[PDB]
Swiss-Prot record:
It comes from the Viruses. Residues 1-167 form the Macro domain. Inhibited in vitro by GRL-0617. The chain holds residues 1025 to 1191 of 7096 of the full protein. It is a multi-pass membrane protein. This is Papain-like protease nsp3.
């Protein structure tokens, strides 16, 4: 048993809810919250800016030190950093950004990072401002992630569309 509440079950291991990933993290304090990161860990908007704002910019300070030491992530890659006040850990995952021209095939590689963690609270990668089709992102998630993933979809008519259209 875990603390996640109000989720619709899509598959054996994937669950979905209409919720802000920030509000959910503050309530649950999950072991792992996933950030929709970029390779520079510049947390300006979408999930990264909201998560970072909720940490009072401590996520950005930590991220800047990570990049200064290690250099940028790969598209499709990830790193584990602190979850600050939101979670034990934050898994920063870089999905491809369609609005920058990145290969959508890298979305599967991005979701494979989730399999290193038994349970995660996550957004849909590459959806929203990243330019990918969220219906596609949910299909890749279900077909790639084998660990238990709780998807928070912030946008209301998108949640309803994802559920209604789910195969
Ligand atoms: N605070 C937040 N900002 C942005 N997104 C992404 C967009 C695209 C899907 C619906 O929301 C979030 N997902 C969960 N929480 C989110």
């Amino acid at each position: 048993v875990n603390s996640f509440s109000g989720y619709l079950k899509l598959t054996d291991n994937v669950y979905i809810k209409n919720a802000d990933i920030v509000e959910e993290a503050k309530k649950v304090k999950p072991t792992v919250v996933v950030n929709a990161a970029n390779v520079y860990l510049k947390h300006g908007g979408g999930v990264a800016g909201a998560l970072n704002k909720a940490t009072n910019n401590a996520m950005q300070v930590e991220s800047d030190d990570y990049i200064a030491t290690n250099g940028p992530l790969k598209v499709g890659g990830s790193c584990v950093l602190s979850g600050h006040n939101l979670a034990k850990h934050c898994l920063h995952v870089v999905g491809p950004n369609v609005n920058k021209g990145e290969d959508i095939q890298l979305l599967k590689s991005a979701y494979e990072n989730f399999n290193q963690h038994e349970v995660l609270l996550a957004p849909l990668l590459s959806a929203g401002i990243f330019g990918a089709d969220p219906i596609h992102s949910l299909r890749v998630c279900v077909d790639t992630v084998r660990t238990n993933v709780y998807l928070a979809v912030f946008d209301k008519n998108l949640y309803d569309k994802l559920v209604s259209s789910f195969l």
